[PDB]
Subunit: 315 residues, 4 copies
């Protein structure tokens, strides 16, 4: 049987009222792979931070570099799973499958979703076709690419969706089928690597907008020495006149400003705002939290606005 | 023919490269109603603020109180339309139809959506069945209730959706059908009224959350004398341990804290956070920007957490 | 505790590799209601037929008429659940809650969905607010009205959706909230009643359409003495020229022809076809299988096309 | 400028109350391509048939083989556009872009969608990145692959969706971005070619199922010398016991039986039906009308059930 490393971080999948505990609860896993489990952390994903991301990434890369390891499965809380998944997609250098999985119902709930989710996740990680597709997220019988996947609902077991594109494949009781290949750069084609990164990453805040908005929190972010700011703008990345004036002054001072959107789907374009006039960056179709991940990494490399915009076009 | 008042505020529906200009561009409107048009403002809805909301609401109420006016149509930019619509739903006291409408493509675009949107909006406002349903939003052949409607995409003409419930009716080239009646309190059943409200409304900020979150912007909001704060939490209104400690201290000091979600749909429940232990409010299934509207209004009446939670259950 | 009758018919909820078996498997049910269980049938819902519908409806009505019964829960396979639910919505005369529930994963599956589905279903049936809302379907933490609900996916646990409107409420671990009230006639306001109905119901076939369509199967339906035919037309109920000519001749001969759509959502309108010229009926926004249910019932009352079209506008 | 051939077939895009008429109505097209227009037919797509498909395919292939032609755009009614698109995806042998486009509102409607749809379609056809992606469908600012795209609503301008996967790219006022590459075989990798095909194609009927189903129409299809039958089954391709017995006898007699689903999305699996025991084929995640297209083509090559099932796994 193929050897799979299972890296546990915590989350509702391990919620109750770590490894293993899991594996012990699903003996059928032993028919499809040899599992090498370890505990990376034991937290709710609401407490996920850079220190854990780096520990997780370093350990994953070490295992991926081992010729005896065929793939890696990571159990993770669902709340920030989309952020961890995108971070790993950009920093891991391997063609072997890396699969994140969680659960929306705690392990002792009636009709808990975790057991079958974990069973498919392992099935996807051992499949030959899962290679070279970047970091994957397997939830609710569906296979998503890391760039595209978002948590869309507070409580539904089907909360994960790819709002701009769609799922790249399906998995039903272990049977895996792919229909689509992601085109944006990932993993081995990424210019980012762990050996070139150090904690802390550059500070990047996210500012929310609404009717009657004022730039006071935006100014507070600048005062706190933010190196970049992602704006969750209204509609197509829009902001009030007063907000725009503050953004212009910030960008002139060398703070990198990214226009994203609070709406949840679709690309941000120039149009009502002339981004080239002020040196702003548009966040493609990434939501604010994924735009922050890419911007934090970009800022370790460069402050050049043209180069950063190119990264948003490629990743 | 029935008399309809048309109140124009600006937006992409009146975008190019006010009244009327519109009406002049759609002569077929004269077959279905007598239109009394006026300009309330001429702004992008990204610049919407309390001063305009109050001017708009006062004028709408005056017209609704006139026995010669059968209904009111308001043209508005799409970016903050969901916020204005919910504000009006809570402060207008009439059973007559009030309909908001906008356009996603500017008036001089190929295949501009505004003309047909405005034609249906007027058709809905003159329909007898449109009475007693609260404030309505008509976009892309669909009729939505003000509480439920959200802009979900940056650029699509079908951007408006009701993610938690659904549309209450359809309108196709003026032909109107209703299938559902909203149950949450609105308009005439609302405890809020214009004669009891004054500008400025209590200050309420919205704080976004993400992996590696820190309460620094939250603290800045407190320092700026916010009376309430809406948290756009991860998943089911969740926050990091450090954030929770700051929220606890704030609530003890008398600042009203509402747990909402960044995810975009679903209700926020107690569960991982014991709201009753700390005096926090959960925002039902309202997104952060609509939760802010209700909280601003609540704070003109009371600071009592139990009473505010009841408002989130009723409105 | 309130008394609830549980009527079991079969389905994947009782699938393995009847009552009770269920109840025995979920002891927490005893804390919320006194359950009176009985087996109406034990079949896959793919084998559902009129004989079982009548047995089920008669038994449900008898129980609903009993002052000791507070509500009725019916366990049913998911494949034809939307058809049974709509049939009951039209023939049961009671204001007490009737709730249908099923499961997408068999009872011995990892992460089986049936237990929690049944727990909520019972919770909805005992809730005072569930009265006067017509027949309800509870699946995957969601409450749907019988007219609107459709199975949209072959295998997903979240397969049920209301594509034209939306869910009327939510239920999360027994906690029930309603947001919308259905407006189309149901239950006590229905003109159909069991005491006026006999098996067999009038024969109604459904004909599918596609590119290169020919009316040969349509003709076979006529030859088999169909009293009505529902056409699952392309787009807005459309058919080829040759098909239209056959439909015209059929309608002239007294066969009732209903134009529905294969597409899955939206209302069918006159437009490319002048229904009034030929005496055709349009199926509102009902899909072909629900249009068949209403037409079968209509045909027990009348053959008058104007009266049948009015039924499609009211139910 | 690049030369694009525009092949017009009819449809609502050319509806009123052919070429050009179109082009004449959109002069901005001349800035992006040299257009060579011709009329292939002038029909509603509800009247689409094999004779027109073959004329259209032959003409498209001839143009694609011309070194002076950079791409082909086909205007088509929306009702059967998904069927024509999939047929062309399987029979055209070229890496050059072939793009189908239509309109949901007639050309003289307020806010007609056709002009901007056609402008993007041409923009996609001239883009270098559009090559090698199979046949494309461009509607409502979105780029879909031919295998995946379905019409889901009777009247909405956003009616086209890819329910199992998602859109492969976006186009906004001519600006094109791709995010995904289709993996199933198409165009140059297809084993089907025009030079090996003749009209009429083998007869294949589609049978709809519902509660109280009987195999009478299925038998009528056999009597009409159908070579294959696609069943639009309930849920996961399911049928009544009586229907299954008829299907078994048919398959034993050499008629090829494909289990599809009426539900609209998801793959059909073996499970409740042992397909291998009876020689049935499952239609992957194709809906009944697209399964019919592939089966008609399969039957020109072979009657071998194993080989036909492999085609459903590859195309
Ligand atoms: N708060 C939990 C939610 C979950 O896992 O579903 C976490 O993200 O760890
Ligand atoms: N920014 C514009 C967008 C629109 O109207 O579509 C506004 O909201 O006024
Ligand atoms: N074929 C099964 C499917 C299910 O229940 O999920 C039935 O409808 O009985
Ligand atoms: N019946 C028309 C519908 C459309 O084009 O939108 C056709 O398919 O030709």
């Amino acid at each position: 049987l193929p050897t799979i490393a299972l890296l546990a971080t915590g989350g509702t999948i391990a919620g109750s009222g770590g490894v293993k505990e899991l594996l012990k609860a699903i003996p059928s896993l032993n028919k499809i792979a040899r599992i090498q489990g370890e505990q990376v952390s034991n937290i709710g994903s609401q407490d996920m931070n850079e220190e854990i991301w780096f520990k997780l990434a370093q350990r994953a890369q070490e295992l991926l570099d081992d010729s005896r390891i065929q793939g890696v499965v990571i159990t993770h809380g669902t709340d920030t799973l989309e952020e961890s998944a995108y971070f790993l997609n950009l920093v891991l250098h391997s063609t072997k499958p890396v699969v994140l999985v969680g659960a929306m119902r705690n392990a002792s709930s009636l009709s808990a979703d975790g057991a079958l989710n974990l069973y498919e996740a392992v099935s996807v990680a051992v499949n030959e076709k899962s290679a070279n597709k970047g970091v994957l997220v397997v939830m609710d019988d569906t296979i998503f690419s890391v760039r595209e996947v978002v948590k869309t609902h507070t409580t539904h077991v089907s909360t994960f969706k790819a709002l701009n594109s769609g799922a790249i494949g399906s998995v039903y009781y272990g049977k895996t089928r792919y229909y689509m290949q992601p085109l944006r750069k990932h993993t081995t084609e990424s210019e980012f690597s762990l050996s070139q990164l150090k904690t802390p990453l550059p500070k990047v805040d996210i500012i929310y907008t609404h009717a009657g908005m004022t730039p006071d929190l935006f100014q507070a972010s600048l005062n706190s020495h933010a190196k970049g700011v992602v704006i969750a703008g209204v509609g197509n990345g829009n902001v009030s006149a007063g907000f725009l004036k503050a953004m212009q002054e910030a960008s002139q001072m060398g703070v990198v400003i990214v226009r994203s959107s609070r709406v949840g789907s679709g690309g941000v374009t120039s149009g009502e705002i002339d981004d080239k006039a002020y040196g702003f960056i548009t966040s493609d179709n990434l939501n604010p939290q994924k735009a922050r991940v890419l911007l934090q990494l970009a800022l370790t490399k460069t402050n050049d606005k043209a180069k950063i915009q190119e990264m948003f076009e490629e990743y």
